Write a protein that binds this DNA or RNA. Structure first.
Ligand SMILES: [Mg+2]
Ligand SMILES: [Mg+2]
Ligand SMILES: [Mg+2]
Ligand SMILES: [Mg+2]
Ligand SMILES: [Mg+2]
Ligand SMILES: [Mg+2]
Ligand SMILES: [Mg+2]
Ligand SMILES: [Mg+2]
Lengths: 61, 293, 204, 159, 170
RNA sequence: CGGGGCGGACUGUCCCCAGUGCGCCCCGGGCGGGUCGCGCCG
RNA sequence: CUCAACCUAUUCUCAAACUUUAAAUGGGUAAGAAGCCCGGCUCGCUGGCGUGGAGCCGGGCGUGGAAUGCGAGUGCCUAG
RNA sequence: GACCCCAGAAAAGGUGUUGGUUGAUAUAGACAGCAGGACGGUGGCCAUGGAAGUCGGAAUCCGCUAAGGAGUGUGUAACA
RNA sequence: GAGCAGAAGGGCAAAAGCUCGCUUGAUCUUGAUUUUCAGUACGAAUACAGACCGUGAAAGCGGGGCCUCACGAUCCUUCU
RNA sequence: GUCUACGGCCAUACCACCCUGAACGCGCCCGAUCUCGUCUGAUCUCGGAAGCUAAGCAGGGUCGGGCCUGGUUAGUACUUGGAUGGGAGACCGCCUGGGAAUACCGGGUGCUGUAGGCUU
């Protein structure tokens, strides 16, 4: 009738068999969850990066 | 004794003091938190406020922004430096509050270099005026009023200081509900009795009313108005000239420091050796008196 | 009606005091903890003897009462009614339960049966203070009281003066120097700090 | 068995320290949090809005978003046999700057300055930290004073 | 010798009339206070329900008003005339202010009116010095300090040295 | 372990009675660290 | 004069659902090239301001910025 | 009696023996044995049916002394 | 040491409690996130953004109750 | 050497009582015409300037309470890991590392930012 209710016995041994891996970090994480007002302004800045190109290359040269 | 001592040892062991300025009764931290703290997505943008403090004999108007190390005052104006131009007596009233607010606004604007732009409202009328930024020019200076613990009812002098600042060219959000011209019954702003208050015509009316009612009471009340030869007829023109002279030269000239001898007016702390010796002497005197019997 | 004390000899559970969660606890058997001349001054009874447990165990309030009665009877027989002061220094604050036998171990949490005192190794169970010439009687009274307790106990003649926390060889000259002021059966320590008015009340 | 309440078991965790109740000091609201800095999530209990969950108390993360009153933090959480990076919105009362990153930035700046200065002065200097080495060989003077003999004390029954 | 800022003064008088119930009796008492002070009085509601007194919570039970200045000084003169200028020793409290009561108001200096009852009332003179208002100030409020406080002995001395009154040791 | 000369401050010994501290300078004694340090010994 | 209550200073003994103080073991993060330092450009966001923030474009820095060990990353199907 | 888990024991006792702690007596004669004395006020007071050193309640002294308790126990109705 | 509707715990003093004044942010919307978690749903919650408003002199604060509970798929019905 | 306005940390800053406070200042203080609130010009709001440092405030004091920081308690309590250690058990000792809290005894009694005054 009655049986065992709960245990975490052997669970850690199972967890470490394929390792407990840290999430894969990388350059350029996603912009999800960022403030929409800030995000749409950033998109406008990226869009208009096009202009001012000749001033940038003049200064660089 | 018959009652429990409430302020026993355990009371002090668990007692938590409030903030120092709360204990001094100088700061409402509930309002300060809402009033000096900047949004986090604005980063190191300074949030400016106009502190207006009315004293028994003075008016202090400051513009400050909060920092972790403490507040930073960028411009201050006082009502005790009003005698430099025009107005000489009757400070800490509504007209002097307007004058010192206007002086603070002019001083700050001159320091920033925005005077030809943002001239404010020169011809003083009590109606609402809000300065708007000019395209192609640096934006209008925006600061928020800090009244502190003053009860902000209609006619409080902090709003005269605010009116002076906004006429000087400072963009301070406000409504006319708290100006002396506002009628609570009709919910209307007269804007002419407010101008009278700005030019101090309530004080002049009081003077000329006492001249009819009681001459000795008139002397006792406006004793320093008989001195400096200030009269209800010239009162408005005195305040107008003070406004103009504030307009021309609002730059503060700090009085030069004085050569002063290093005289200590406060008793210093007794040293540990002095305290121990005092205890020894008191014990010796008690024992000697006991031996004398 | 009561279980053998071997069923509650050991400190197996966490302390289970009579509280607002543990209600309906029958009163402990021992209600008197000081006997003899409790009103005797500190200087009257300079000799102190302790019973000290060598066991980390639980002593029932019934056993504390029995040992108290036995030691009191022997002390009255040997030193007179007013010749000693005894203090039982264990209070039965732990509540032992009983699951009286729906059916079986279903809902097995028990009801409060009794109280025990939880005692540690090196802890004092009972103390007797008396004159210097009653050392043998104190040792024998404590030795007799030892037979009412489960574990092993030692009889120790304390180095302190009476029931105080000050050593018996320095007690007298501390009283002389007014570092100690008698107050009933104990002494009050007077440090050399505080207001000088308190010091002026002394030395006068 | 156990409830799933959001504040179960936080009786001391979210309580205030002794004699540190009352008004929140305003420097905590004056701290500046940029994107990319490391913050420890404390979780004070005077402020109930924007409070982190109990699994994030004592955890450190990196800010990725800044709003008017809160920040978004990428903080690692371990769920059984995987660690995964949660994104949580926390009001600034419940965080503070982590000083490990401050110390590391100080050390990087020191290293860069010392390298630039060392190339100019000519000689070579050590930049990596090293674990505490074995102690060097040294002399111990007695100063004409014989070392004190130590003897274990006899046993006596204290009380 | 004595600083002029230490002179004792009357802060307020605090007239009180506690009627058992509400209604016309309380309205008449309010009219009594109106006649005596020339001020609109304020009603006091019951804190709790007491079955024995037949009063209920939030029910208008008493009427009271505080008077300050020359009017308070005049009303105190009237009341002390009624008491015939003798006060009991226990009538002075340990905080330095005192009080008494009268059971008939018609001899205070008012005319009898048949519609108006015969309500008695309580006077409680609150004594003060110049500077006591810092405890009531909004900004930088403080406490008056030990030397500036008024003791029972100083209150009795002031009573004797102002109204030539007699302190009966009762 | 301490000595000389000037400003405060304490004591129920108050007749220039007694005692404690601080800032400047003049000395005396002992201990530790660097010093082209300087010599001697190993 | 005595016994209570009450207050004051002490005294014996305690707490899983008490606590000022408070370990050991433990949990998180960091220990660089995606970094550091220079210039410049974009923005409709923010704004006293050449402000703030973010993004972007060039340039220069290698003593590879604790120890130890090990080759890693990633996908699909999947039994018991 | 005889080896982790482990397969049997407690409180309490011992003039069995072995170590140890603390105290005391003794060539001014200990200890143990054998051998002498162990008195007088006084059959102390109150309890009583009899309580005499010995059923009890307090007292607990004095002289002669080398020394003796106004009593350690047996015993008597109480003495002896 | 009170109160904050209630169980308890946390929190709170010119507060979050009490009394007034004005109100309907207990409204209309899209997403992200947290909690349980399989990182599914529901419920509850947090931070935003866009409207329209409330209040306050204003800074601001408010899209229910100081926080931790107070609740409900497919199919069908009903209303907008 | 100090104060005022606004503050940061939030008692080394608090609490009780006593003493001193020059100059500005801050206050107490004087009044209710206007503004504005009250049962009450007490508070609040407003207009002042005869008086006063009595109070707040500042500084100092107290074998002061508290608080802060040390010593002691004490390598004690507790504790990571180890043993075919002891013991009938309860528990205890050792090895390997870490390591407290009272009582008790000392020292200390606000530091400081911005702006503006006074102090020969
Ligand atoms: Mg089974
Ligand atoms: Mg199963
Ligand atoms: Mg406010
Ligand atoms: Mg158990
Ligand atoms: Mg809420
Ligand atoms: Mg919105
Ligand atoms: Mg102290
Ligand atoms: Mg160890």
């Amino acid at each position: 009738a009655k049986s065992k209710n709960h245990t975490t016995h052997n669970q850690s041994r199972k967890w470490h068999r394929n390792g407990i891996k840290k999430p894969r970090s990388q350059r350029y994480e996603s912009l999800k969850g960022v403030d929409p007002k800030f995000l749409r302004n950033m998109r406008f800045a990226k869009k208009h990066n096009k202009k001012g190109l000749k001033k940038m290359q003049a200064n660089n040269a | 004794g018959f009652v429990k001592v409430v302020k026993n040892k355990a009371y002090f062991k668990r007692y938590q003091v409030k903030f120092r300025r709360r204990r001094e009764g100088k700061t409402d931290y509930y309002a300060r938190k809402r009033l000096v703290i900047q949004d986090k997505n604005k980063y190191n943008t300074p949030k400016y406020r106009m502190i207006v403090r009315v004293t028994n004999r003075d008016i202090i108007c400051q513009i400050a922004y909060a920092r972790i190390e403490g507040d930073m005052i960028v411009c201050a104006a006082y009502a005790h430096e009003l005698p430099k131009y025009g107005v000489k007596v009757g400070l800490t009233n509504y007209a002097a509050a307007y004058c010192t607010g206007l002086l603070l606004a002019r001083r700050l604007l001159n320091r920033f270099g925005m005077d030809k732009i943002y001239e404010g409202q020169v011809e003083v009328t009590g109606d609402e005026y809000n300065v708007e930024s000019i395209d192609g020019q640096p934006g209008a200076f925006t600061c928020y009023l800090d009244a502190g613990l003053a009860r902000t009812t209609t006619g409080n002098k902090v709003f005269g200081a605010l009116k002076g600042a906004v006429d000087g060219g400072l963009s301070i959000p406000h409504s006319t509900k708290r100006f002396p011209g506002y009628d609570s019954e009709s919910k209307e702003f007269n804007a002419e009795v407010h101008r009278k208050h700005i030019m101090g015509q309530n004080v002049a009316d009081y003077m000329r009313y006492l001249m009819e009612e009681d001459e000795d009471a008139y002397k006792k009340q406006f004793s320093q108005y008989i001195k400096n030869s200030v009269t209800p007829d010239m009162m408005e023109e005195m305040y107008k000239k003070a406004h103009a002279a504030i307009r021309e030269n609002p730059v503060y000239e700090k009085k030069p420091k004085k050569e002063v001898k290093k005289k200590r007016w406060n008793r210093p702390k007794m040293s540990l050796a002095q305290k121990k010796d005092r205890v020894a002497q008191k014990k010796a005197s008690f024992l000697r008196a006991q031996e004398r019997a | 009606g009561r279980r053998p004390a071997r069923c509650y000899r050991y400190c197996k559970n966490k302390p289970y005091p009579k509280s607002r969660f543990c209600r309906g606890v029958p009163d402990a058997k021992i209600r008197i903890f000081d006997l003899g001349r409790k009103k005797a001054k500190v200087d009257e009874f300079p000799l102190g003897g302790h019973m000290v447990s060598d066991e980390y165990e639980q002593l029932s309030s019934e056993a504390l009462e029995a040992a108290r009665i036995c030691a009191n009877k022997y002390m009255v027989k040997s030193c007179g009614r007013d010749g000693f002061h005894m203090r039982v220094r264990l209070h039965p604050f732990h509540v032992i339960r009983i699951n009286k036998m729906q059916t079986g171990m279903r809902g097995a949490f028990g009801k409060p049966q009794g109280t025990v005192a939880r005692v540690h190794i090196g802890q004092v169970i009972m103390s007797i203070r008396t004159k210097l010439q009653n050392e043998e009687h104190v040792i024998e009274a404590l030795r007799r009281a030892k037979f009412k307790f489960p574990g092993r106990q030692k009889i120790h003649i304390s180095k302190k003066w009476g029931f105080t926390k000050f050593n018996a060889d320095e007690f007298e000259d501390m009283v002389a120097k007014k570092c100690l002021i008698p107050d009933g059966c104990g002494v009050k320590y007077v440090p050399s700090h505080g207001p000088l008015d308190k010091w002026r009340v002394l030395h006068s | 068995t156990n409830t799933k309440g959001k504040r179960r078991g936080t009786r001391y965790m979210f309580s205030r320290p002794f004699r540190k109740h009352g008004v929140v000091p305003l420097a905590t609201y004056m701290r500046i949090y940029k994107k990319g800095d490391i913050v420890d999530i404390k979780g004070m209990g005077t402020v109930q809005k924007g409070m982190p969950h109990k699994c994030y108390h004592g955890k450190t993360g990196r800010v990725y978003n800044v709003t008017q009153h809160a920040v978004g933090i990428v903080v690692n959480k371990q769920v059984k046999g995987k660690i995964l990076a949660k994104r949580i919105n926390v009001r600034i009362e419940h965080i503070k700057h982590s000083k490990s990153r401050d110390s590391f930035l100080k050390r990087v700046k020191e290293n860069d300055q010392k390298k630039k200065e060392a190339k100019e002065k000519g000689t070579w200097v050590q930049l990596k930290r090293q674990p505490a080495p074995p102690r060097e060989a040294h002399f111990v003077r007695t100063n004409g004073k014989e070392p004190e003999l130590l003897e274990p004390i006899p046993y006596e029954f204290m009380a | 010798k004595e600083n002029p800022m230490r002179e004792l003064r009357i802060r307020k008088l605090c007239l009180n009339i506690c009627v058992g119930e509400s209604g016309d009796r309380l309205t008449r008492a309010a009219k009594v206070l109106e006649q005596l002070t020339g001020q609109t009085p304020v009603f006091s509601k019951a804190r709790y329900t007491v079955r024995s007194f037949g009063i209920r919570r939030n029910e208008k039970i008493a009427v009271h008003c505080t008077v300050r200045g020359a009017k308070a000084e005049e009303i105190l003169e009237k009341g002390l005339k009624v008491r015939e200028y003798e006060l009991r020793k226990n009538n002075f409290s340990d905080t330095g202010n005192f009080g008494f009561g009268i059971q008939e108001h018609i001899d205070l200096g008012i005319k009898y009116d048949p519609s108006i009852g015969i309500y008695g009332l309580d006077f409680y003179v609150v004594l003060g010095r110049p500077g006591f208002s810092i405890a009531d100030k909004k900004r930088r409020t403080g406490c008056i300090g030990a030397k500036h406080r008024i003791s029972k002995e100083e209150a009795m001395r002031w009573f004797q040295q102002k109204y030539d009154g007699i302190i009966l040791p009762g």
